[PDB]
Target: Antibiotic biosynthesis monooxygenase
Amino acid sequence: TYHVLVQFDVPSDKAEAFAAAGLFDANGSLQNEPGTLRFEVIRDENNRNRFYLDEVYEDEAAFLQHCRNETIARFYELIDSYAFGPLFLFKGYRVE
Amino acid sequence: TYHVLVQFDVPSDKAEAFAAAGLFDANGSLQNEPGTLRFEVIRDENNRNRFYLDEVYEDEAAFLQHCRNETIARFYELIDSYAFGPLFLFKGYRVEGGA
Model:
């Protein structure tokens, strides 16, 4: 499996809005993309502005397909006015 | 849930030894620790030396329990001579209720 960790920063008063947008992305991607296997939104325990998306795909091609799909485009429409990112913390493969 | 992302760097000739140690840590923690819910070893797609541990716990207390248990202690005994880390990339809480 192909694991992609993404980091975003948002104004503190936009944190709840970002989290909703992240779950919108997760909901739509998991449901409609056969290559998208897991998609979690994580809030930093102390940094008031920082969130992480922990994404799992069958392979890199599935991630590139996600990048070309409608849900991620809808996600960016929601956050574009205020968010900073994506910053890719890593892309890698699971050691099974 | 409480999510912890850990990063390690190892010399190239110790990458297989690190993976074996990480697989021991993941299987030993998941099998024996009721608060340890998920534990994945991930190798960077290009960086030959870099590994990540993606750990999920019931709450912060369960991570701190993991930290005081015997599985992690043997993991560090296996990797001490060659590894660089842990570097904590993040600790955080999952936003719940999604599909």
